[PDB]
Design a protein around this nucleic acid. Structure first.
Lengths: 96, 50, 76, 63
RNA sequence: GGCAUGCUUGAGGUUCUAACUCUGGUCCGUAAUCCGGAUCGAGGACAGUGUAUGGUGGGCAGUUUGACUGGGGCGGUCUCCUCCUAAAGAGUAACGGAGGAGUACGAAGGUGCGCUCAGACCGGUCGGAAAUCGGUCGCAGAGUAUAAAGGCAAAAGCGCGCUUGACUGCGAGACAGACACGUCGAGCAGGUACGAAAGUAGGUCUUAGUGAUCCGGUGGUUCUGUAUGGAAGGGCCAUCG
RNA sequence: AUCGCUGUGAAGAUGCAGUGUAUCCGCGGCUAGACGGAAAGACCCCGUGAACCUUUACUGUAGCUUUGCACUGGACUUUG
RNA sequence: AUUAAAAACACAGCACUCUGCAAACACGAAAGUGGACGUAUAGGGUGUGACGCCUGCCCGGUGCCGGAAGGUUAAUUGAUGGGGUUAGCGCAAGCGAAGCUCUUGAUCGAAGCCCCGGUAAACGGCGGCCGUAACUAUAACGGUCCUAAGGUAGCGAAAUU
RNA sequence: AACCCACUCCCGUUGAAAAGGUAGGGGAUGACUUGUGGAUCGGAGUGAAAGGCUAAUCAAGCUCGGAGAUAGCUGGUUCUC
RNA sequence: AAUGGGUCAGCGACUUAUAUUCAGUGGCAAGCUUAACCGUAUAGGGUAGGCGUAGCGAAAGCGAGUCUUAAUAGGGCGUU
C-alpha cells in the first residue's frame, strides 16, 4: 500500500457497504448438480448428505445453470423462475 | 455569500441547494424550480440550516 | 518584487489535424477563445472546445468575411 | 490464515468477477460548490485501474 | 398576608462525648524511650486517610521542534491562474523575468423582447481641458464583475417583461492523464421558462475563486436490524462542519 | 626492478607522455616529498539518529491543594 | 584524580523569607528517621560576601502576601422537556395510563481565575522619536510623544568603549 | 623538615610511569594530614560546585537480560559458459 | 595523492517455517483435494473444510439479472 508517502488508495477512496450477516448461512445450488442427491427428494439435509452444501447453511436458492435430468422433488428450497420451469419440465414438483 | 437550502412545502425535502447574499436582502426567496420526487413545483423556502 | 509561480500549462492546441477521420464526439480543437470557428458538423463547446458532431474528415477552410479560420467536417 | 489482509482495504475495495470495485472521492462535505454534473458522475461504483490492481491486491492479500 | 409549634430535608456558629487522633502523664505485659493493653489528660466529629473531583505542578517523564536552499543559517518560498523563457504540435527547469486568485452574480444566468462603441471636431450668463446633449467628419482605438493571454456584431455590453435550463435521470465519443482527480459533450421522459414559431437554454466571452480520507451533524430511504416484533446502531442517497 | 624536470590526469605524479640524468650495495646524519604513520574528522553539512539540559512548546504526572461521599455522632440555636 | 588553582567556590559579616514544635524541610508507597533529644538569640531555604562610606527611582508584567464578596467554574444532585417499547379505548387509523428504558439537563456545588490592595537585599525594569547643541550614538533642555518609572550618589575609553 | 599538596620549567610521550621524575614552589596547630572499621548508589548518591566524583569508565557506573533493539546508512556477498 | 587488504591456511553472508501468487511439470477432471485424527502406520480410511461449476447489487434480494427515478424509457458489471 505504501506509495512513497502520499495518500494511498486504501486511505484515499471512501469505505463503502456493509457485509450482510443474513447471507452467511445462504447458499446457491444449480440445476446441473440437483441430480447428485439420492432418493428423488432434494431437501436441505439431502443437499448436505451429498457434499453440495456446507453445514450451517439453512437457506438454499437454486438457479438455472444446466440440465436437471432426473425427476426430483424440492421441499423447503427456493427456486428461481427459469429454474422452476426446468425442473417441472423434467417431471419435478415443489412443496414446503 | 453563505450557503442556503431550498426545501419543499410538504413532508418531502428534495432540497436543491445554492447560496446568496443575505447581507443585501434579509428576507427569503419564493422562486420555484423542478422537483424529481413530488413532481410538482413548490415554494422553495428558507435554508434554516439549524 | 518577488517572481515565481507559473501555472500548470493547459495542453491546448489543434488535436486531430486536418485530414483525419473523426468519430462523432471527438474533441477537435482545444482552444482559449475560438481562434478557430465552427464549420459544418462541429459543435463549439462551452470553453470554446470544437467537437465533431458527425463522422467524416476535418477540413480546415478559411471562409467568409472577418477572415474566420473554420473547422468543418465533411462526411467523406 | 497466516497472512493478514488490511482490514482498512477491504472496506474500500469489494471484489467482483469483473475486478475490484470502489467508490469515488470528492463526494463529501463540499457539494454546493461543484456542479451537478460532477456530483452525478461520481455517484456510482467504479472499477480499479490496471496500474492500481497490483498495489491493492497486495494489501488485500491476493498476490 | 400567614400564627404558635410538633414531624422534618439544607448552609452557620459555638458547644457536648462516645467515633477517630495524641511523636502527653501513669500502670502492666517487662529486666524495653519499640509495641500493644488498661487508665488519666488533651483535641474532637475537626483532623486524617480511602475514593471521586477542580486547581496548581519543568519536581519528574515521553516527545515534537518541516522542506527547498549555487554549503548551512537569515530572508523568501510552498496550492491555483495568465504571459515570457519554451526552440512556429503537446510538454519543458532555475532563490529566472512579469503580474494575479482563496471571489463575485437570484441578474451580472437562461430566454423572449428591445437596443449598439470610443475619439477628435465644439455651442458660454454660474460646469467653459472636460457634463446634461443637440447634431456635423467617425473608420474598435471602447466596452467584457475581476490578473494577463486568447477572443468577439449571429454581439461574447445595457433596458425590460417571464419570472427559471444556475433543470432530474443520464450519456455515444473524445481531450488531458502515473494514480486520485480533471475537461468537453445529445436524444426520450420528469418536465420546463420563454418565442406566436424554426429553435435556443444542463449557468456566466474562456481559462483562477480551492481541499482527499477518517470521524461527527442533518433530512430522506425500499436496505440491514445478533431469539422474535420493534427500536438502537449500521449501509445507501442527499447535504453541513 | 621505488630518479629530476616539464606537461597530462578524479584538477599538486617514483610509476602516464616527452626528455634529461643515473655503475652495484651499505653506514652516519638531516627531515623536503611519499597529499608519511597514529584516531571509520572533532569544525561543517547530513540523518523524519541519540542523549542530556531549558521553558511561557505539546501531552502527561509525583507532590501540594479544593469540594462531594465514606470512616462520622446528639444537642440546641443564627439560619432556609 | 589525568591539559584550567583562578578573578571561580567557600568564608566571617549582612539582609530577605519560611517555621509555634507531631515545626518549616528532607529521606521514605508506609511505619519511621533526620532536623533534634534542638525550640524563634532556634532551625530550614535564598541571595550578597571582611571592613569603611553607602545602597536612588519603578508594584505595570510575573511571583508571593492579604482582601471583600460579585461574576464565571468540577465531580455530585436529577427539575423539566424530547424520544423507544405496550396495556388498553376507538370498527380500524389512532393515541396511549402505568411501567421499564434512552437522552435532555433547570437548581445545588469549593478552591482557582476575573477583580481590589500591598510587596523589589521578590524575578525583573530604570525609554526611543526627531530636528536640537555638539559628535559617531547621550535627558542639559523647549521638548513631540510614550511608559509602571525613565537612572540618584558614585564611577567611567573600565575584567565593560 | 617529616607529612600533605601540585604553581613553574625541562625531560619523558613506543615512557622507568595508562599522569611520573629532577631542579625550584604552597600549606605545614589546623576549615590539617592520616590508619582502621562503618554509612549513603545509578534520574541515585556525593559534591567549600568542576558536570566534579561514585574501582585507570561518568551530561547518568558496571554487569546480565529484553536482544540478532533499530540503522531510508556503511561495508562486504564466494564456480563457469 | 579516494576506500580496503602485511601474507598464508582455515572459517565467513539469500536460509527456514507458515500463508500466498505466477510459471513449468504431473495426477484426476465438472469436479478436485482432504485437515486433525484412526491406522498390524509413507498404505488404507477420514471429504469437516477449502477452491471450482453464476453473476449483479451496499443490502434485502433477483437470478443468465439488479440500481435509479413516478418511469420495464436511456448506460456499468456478468453471461453459451
Amino acid at each position: 500500500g505504501f506509495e512513497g508517502g502520499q495518500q494511498p488508495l486504501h486511505r484515499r477512496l471512501p469505505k463503502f457497504g456493509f457485509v450482510s450477516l443474513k447471507a452467511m448461512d445462504r447458499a446457491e445450488v444449480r440445476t446441473s448438480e440437483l441430480a447428485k442427491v439420492e432418493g428423488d427428494v432434494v431437501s436441505l439435509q439431502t443437499l448436505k448428505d451429498a457434499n453440495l452444501i456446507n453445514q450451517h447453511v439453512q437457506r438454499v436458492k437454486v438457479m438455472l445453470s444446466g440440465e436437471v435430468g432426473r425427476a426430483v422433488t424440492l421441499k423447503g428450497i427456493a427456486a428461481t423462475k427459469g429454474a422452476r420451469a426446468a425442473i417441472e419440465a423434467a417431471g419435478g414438483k415443489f412443496e414446503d | 455569500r453563505e450557503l442556503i437550502r431550498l426545501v419543499s412545502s410538504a413532508g418531502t425535502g428534495h432540497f436543491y441547494t445554492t447560496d446568496k447574499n443575505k447581507r443585501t436582502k434579509p428576507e427569503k426567496i419564493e422562486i420555484k424550480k423542478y422537483d424529481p420526487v413530488v413532481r410538482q413545483h413548490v415554494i422553495y423556502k428558507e435554508a434554516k440550516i439549524k | 518584487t518577488r517572481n515565481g509561480r507559473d501555472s500548470e500549462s493547459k495542453r491546448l492546441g489543434v488535436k486531430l489535424f486536418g485530414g483525419q477521420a473523426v468519430k462523432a464526439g471527438n474533441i477537435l480543437v482545444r482552444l482559449r477563445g475560438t481562434k478557430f470557428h465552427a464549420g459544418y458538423g462541429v459543435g463549439l463547446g462551452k470553453d470554446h472546445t470544437l467537437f465533431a458532431k458527425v463522422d467524416g474528415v476535418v477540413k480546415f477552410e478559411t471562409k467568409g468575411a472577418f477572415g474566420r479560420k473554420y473547422v468543418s467536417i465533411v462526411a467523406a | 490464515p497466516k497472512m493478514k489482509t488490511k482490514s482498512g482495504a477491504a472496506k474500500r475495495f469489494k471484489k467482483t468477477a469483473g475486478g475490484l470495485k470502489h467508490k469515488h472521492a470528492f463526494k463529501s462535505h463540499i457539494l454546493t460548490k461543484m456542479t451537478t454534473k460532477r456530483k452525478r458522475q461520481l455517484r456510482g461504483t467504479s472499477m480499479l485501474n490496471k496500474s492500481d490492481v497490483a498495489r491493492v491486491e497486495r494489501s488485500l492479500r491476493l498476490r
